[model samples]
Target: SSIPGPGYCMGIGPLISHGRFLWMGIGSACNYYNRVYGEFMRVWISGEETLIISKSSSMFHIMKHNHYSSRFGSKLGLQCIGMHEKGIIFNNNPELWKTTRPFFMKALSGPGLVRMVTVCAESLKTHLDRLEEVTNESGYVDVLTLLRRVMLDTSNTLFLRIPLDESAIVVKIQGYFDAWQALLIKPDIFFKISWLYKKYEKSVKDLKDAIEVLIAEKRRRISTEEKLEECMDFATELILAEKRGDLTRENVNQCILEMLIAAPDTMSVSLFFMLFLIAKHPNVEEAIIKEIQTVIGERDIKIDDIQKLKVMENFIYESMRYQPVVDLVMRKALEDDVIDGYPVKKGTNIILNIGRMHRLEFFPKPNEFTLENFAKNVPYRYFQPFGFGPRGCAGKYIAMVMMKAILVTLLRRFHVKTLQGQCVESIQKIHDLSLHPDETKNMLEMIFTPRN
Candidate 1:
């Protein structure tokens, strides 16, 4: 059977079927298609039908099968930024991705988790203190920027092997954010416009140079200085790999750049959204605050206290379900196969519509943001927070700790309120679930009242 969806007009299905609401976020638009055309739906992207699987059963089949084991490439945009390959996140080649994948797993394991918690705890405190210094009495701070900075600090210290306070890292970050949007949503013509490509390249160069500078320092230390007794963090993990001759200089540089991108791009966005929701809902905030007070009142967040904050965990889970950061998980089919009574062609682009799957009614009020959504069973079955299988996020546990530690640390010190009295709604109202660095940047206005 032909996969169901709106037929393309002028060769663009989104413009045809999606219509005006095409301007809405990808998650919402895809969910609407799922509603209109059962579980399996097809949308024309670039002259081919990219299958979107939303039904839980179908998703399981796609995820479990070896035929669909391939990771999706960044295609045109990351290519423009020179991030299309060489790193774990967007490495299009399966063989290259396979070789480098173990380093991250090993990097975040053992001593790494311990260091991550410590770094997250310490980094957040140090940065929050910085914010508190300049913040007026009852003044608002940019929690999104705060999260980004703190995560970058942790990422730099943990992965890039850099000292604190050396954050000339600003301009490149703006560069990354700028070029990222261009290739992500817009046509490639923007870059073909010459000046735009040059600007984007310059930004990427600054990013590469900044990271390479740190790499040079690391290499100098290792070339002359003695190696540590054991691996402490991700940087050391790759360092050992370099010693083994597994990765070249450019290889290490690419990995560092990818980690830098993943640090703020992935973690901070979700953490901000999690905190955003907690602040918007009075009950969640009150419950979480009470939970924190009862669990570890007035004390710095301990790693042991991580599992103890049951309510906070539930809140985090619900927030992810409601506003999944990586809303679409893309994959390439290795072999032709039939799915949900439909033929899935070999080499066809398949996308897992995480938004629609999460929105499916396994729980009460699937659309409403509430803790009861995770109050019962089968929610876990429907969920894929850090993604699934081989390409799943390596630093998931580290990410969770960072999320909890940041929120706990902040709430322990102050109560949060949105500026102008307009609370943040779902990413559904904002851009397509892209998780751009500055999606919440300008609106980064939130007041923090001291909890006397």
Candidate 2:
């Protein structure tokens, strides 16, 4: 009689088997409910009446107000992994967020922005130079493999000042996230099995172990001659916070791993999608090229030059909306709230249907991949890629500048295209399953020809 949704009696709402939850992801899962119940609906995932909303009108209110400020990070298996009260993503305490976040924001913005672009350009040049060497041997280089290396290098160069390889660490993080997703979707008595729990422990240990070495070195530097008043890298600053006693040892290590984990996969995933979109839409690529060539002709790239590439910027907006990195955003209400005239309790889980909202509300012909989505007039409230309000993504500016730097660098150097007789859609299908059981290889292998 109240909120309209199917399967009160069907156990886990409409998603009878948790397998469907694993298959479609929560964003698409809520999308199924949204299509039927209009804007607001309720579904049972463990006997809790989880509220889902797709309305753009109240998005600002829901995101802005402290009433809707908290998130469901624990639900995603952060609790089991010991990510409590530390790091940006898992930590819900406003006090903790206030502590570490400003350092990150300051680091990623002004001098930080310049540093990120500079290091990124240096990293990209080295990797691309390596690519040129490899291309001298093989006719076509695997972009997936190439991008992973680039993502790791650029990330490590900026975040960690030490010389450590992410070869094992990065792939481990990928599998850890994939495995965690499955466990959360089902979360049955199966976790009682020792082997499964051991696996979780091992995954957590692997990440901690990698950063543990870095932690020791940074602490040593502080104890010795390293004056960290204004250190060039972020690690020293984080180390100083620990010395002053604001964060625990675990918190500092978690913060380090968290910084490393955040950039590599998320940014690379976007680049993966962007390259596919570029291949499929030749006209869009041309406009991107036209903007790049006109604004930033083959020279030393900078933040100001990247700002001038409007067409490339629009491409990023469209790509993010078309297939956002992680579809559904989960937020638990802090207090009683009214969203689209429905009463939401203090502890209710508010599922922000970002994918559905992007499609149904804001842009014209949302189905089609058109720059008109961003090129034409569209309100920022209507289209939020990173997220909205106070608890929004801290690395957004860094993400923006870095993505532009990568695409600009690649487009300037290489003429990227899908292999002969291969379609972008088929490759996307492969990527969809990369996390689905056996997603080992990157299927989007394209040719890269250096321009004259």
Candidate 3:
């Protein structure tokens, strides 16, 4: 098989340069200049055809419609979330996504959505209080650590009602998450080793067993009459909704798995990058704090209040330009078709690299970290932090709401700063599935200064 273009660059050494990592550029460039080779075509990897997607083309709909047979399953494995056989994420067709996605979508609408936002806000409050109390007189504490704990805390509680207590759960789950993330990089080991595979398998089973027990317990307590009123939280409501024929238990479970997988990492990365950006740009920090102060004056942030914190939101958007969570989305061609004049054969893995678009010539001073990239209304075609189209992230609403609430609490209460003599430099290292911080720990430290 003749190699076509840049998508097959994985075998070569890392594309070491200004921003390209080997797998990183392979992923991004395909989404960038991939149009040159037509919409969908083959790039040979070990003599097998891989697919690529371009932003301008409508290949997104292709992935959306053919959800089950999409190439994501080839890439997704037992190691990743919802990849356990019959789990929602690994299901290869619309039938699976069709059934499960609605349960989650419904749970995320109206009162359910309102409840998620409120819970996230309330959870951040407890964390921020602790952050305030623990910081030195200068308010310097590890932002990532606090964010990680809170993000995990909020996600687990909202999804499973299983808090991150009992060190055993934390230990197993941390391993499970680490194994899942490692799939992006260590394909050989992750796939080949039965022992490695069993770890995630066990974690999934453990989580399933715990969740089943919780659901069963909840079901025993509630009667049909009780279903009329909104239950204590989403889990109860989801079960009631399931009982009402709105969703199935499998659908509900898959939605929870999807929610758990989506919530923690994206929020953690956003919190990490946001604090990093603030530490690097003190003026931006001052601006956000001033804006936050101007908004709430003396009250805690309500969900509606998140809208008024424009500067803070813009700053976070700018930070993502510098540090993103998901670097690219990988899809496959399930049919023999033509996109923008290129032939896409069934079973070809299509990788879309949308990351470099953030720095394209069309954008204003693309290299600079400017929140105006968002405020100026950059065309939707150019910016896809949470991805776009049907296969894009499902929990974007939760991620954004949580990020805004956390930043609001941080900026308003503490004078966030870098450690003394510990200058912060954020170098982007592309993990298998994400863009990570080089000096991950030192990026953001807060100075717990009393408001003057």
The segments of candidate 1 whose C-alpha lies over 4 angstroms from its true place after superposition are: 8-32, 73-76, 132-138, 164-167, 184-193, 426-429, 433-443
| TM-score for candidate 2, residues paired by index | 0.90
Candidate order by decreasing lDDT: 1, 2, 3
Please give the range of 10 consecutive residues that has the lowest summed lDDT in model 1: 426-435
lDDT of model 2, residue 40: 80
Clashing residue pairs in all predictions, respectively, total 0, 1, 16
Better by lDDT, candidate 3 or 1: 1
Write the number of the candidate with greater TM-score, choosing between 1 and 2.
Answer: 2
Q: How does candidate 1 fare on TM-score?
A: 0.88
- The pairs that clash in candidate 1 are none
Error of 2 at 307 (Å): 1.8
Comparing candidate 2 with candidate 3, which one achieves the higher TM-score?
2
Error of 1 at 423 (Å): 1.8
- Cα-based lDDT at residue 154, candidate 3: 74
Off by over 4 Å in 3: 1-3, 6-48, 52-71, 79-87, 132-140, 156-173, 184-213, 223-228, 237-251, 420-430, 438-450
Candidate 2 off by > 4 Å = 10-24, 73-76, 132-138, 185-188, 230-232, 420-424, 428-442
